[PDB]
Write a protein that binds this ligand. Sequence first.
Ligand SMILES: NC1=N[C@@]2(CO1)c1cc(-c3cncc(Cl)c3)ccc1O[C@@H]1COCC[C@H]12
Ligand code: NI
Length: 397
Amino acid sequence: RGSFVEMVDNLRGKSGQGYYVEMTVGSPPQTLNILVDTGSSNFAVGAAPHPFLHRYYQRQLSSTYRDLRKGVYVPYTQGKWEGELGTDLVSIPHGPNVTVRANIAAITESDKFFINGSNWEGILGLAYAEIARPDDSLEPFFDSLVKQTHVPNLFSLQLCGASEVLASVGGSMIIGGIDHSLYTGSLWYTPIRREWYYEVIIVRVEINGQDLKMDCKEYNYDKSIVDSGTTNLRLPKKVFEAAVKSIKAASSTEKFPDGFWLGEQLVCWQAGTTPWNIFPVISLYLMGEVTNQSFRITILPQQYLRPVEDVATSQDDCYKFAISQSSTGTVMGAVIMEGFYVVFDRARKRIGFAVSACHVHDEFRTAAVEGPFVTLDMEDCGYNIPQTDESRSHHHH
Ligand SMILES: NC1=N[C@@]2(CO1)c1cc(-c3cncc(Cl)c3)ccc1O[C@@H]1COCC[C@H]12
Ligand code: NI
């Protein structure tokens, strides 16, 4: 292999509203646009009329649909979806040339799930069974794909970032391999700490080469994950505050409102005059495959300042600050992923990063992937989430 031309450029979306892939469900195939989400584990599709849907999965039109006679209820921080579990035939038209029978949650009711204008009608959770709903016995889509076909247990994502409409985004999801045209330089791997989310360990953070000098467990409190289903780089409270202070200090020639640093207000410059060089690079050092090694991924303001073309100020280039506070750990969302070709090597329990052939940069700086960095007697930077009685009581047969 080494080339997967048919799968290149198979992702689309609107800026800040997620990346989606075309999928088919049912016999004959019904096409739907599906949000690619490495931060969840259910395949769920709109299956009833909704104000924001032009189309939905019509179960009655599929000769191959089977009802599982079981519902599923999925509340989360920003919304809720619920529906009926079933199985049907699924394919990815610009993916592997295979058809699999997968679990499909037919979304019958939701709140704040669908987005007006995002153009997606469902979600493809690519994470592990441990976080599937209702429970871990509901086989996720990728597991079914691997078990039913000869598709290698690996996928990779190249997310490429950007007056009346939001900017169109594009990218590639390569299923079953690595496409060498999508990256340059070295491909560096960090271990998947545990198979639930795509959990990783950050060992060090630098802002313009300056170490934040925190106990490294703070960087992974209470976890750090790689999440295509999050736009921002989200950082634990303490880390966020230290980062903002450092970025403010570096960009201090400009005095932005508090709203900007909160991601609640755009800041603008006259077209093509954005002073990129006043904003610092951000480096996250990730644990290497070798104990005592790390490598760093470095992003630019071109990644963490998101372009938004507002109607009133269409003469100007306007930006949203896309680093935000978390209480659920580090989330390496599109802000991180748009710099890199990211390999989800499930077979080898590791995540690969390389400089993306499509990342946004200037003639002075580039997003980078660099290593090795060796630390004598490296500490354990992993956080151990307190075990609840709820979690502990679960039997895992
Ligand atoms: N990983 C992740 N998945 C979440 C939340 O975090 C999500 C995200 C978005 C979404 C909306 N706008 C932009 C993007 Cl990138 C994603 C839309 C729906 C959505 O529902 C998911 C349902 O499962 C829990 C995690 C949810
Ligand atoms: Ni038991």
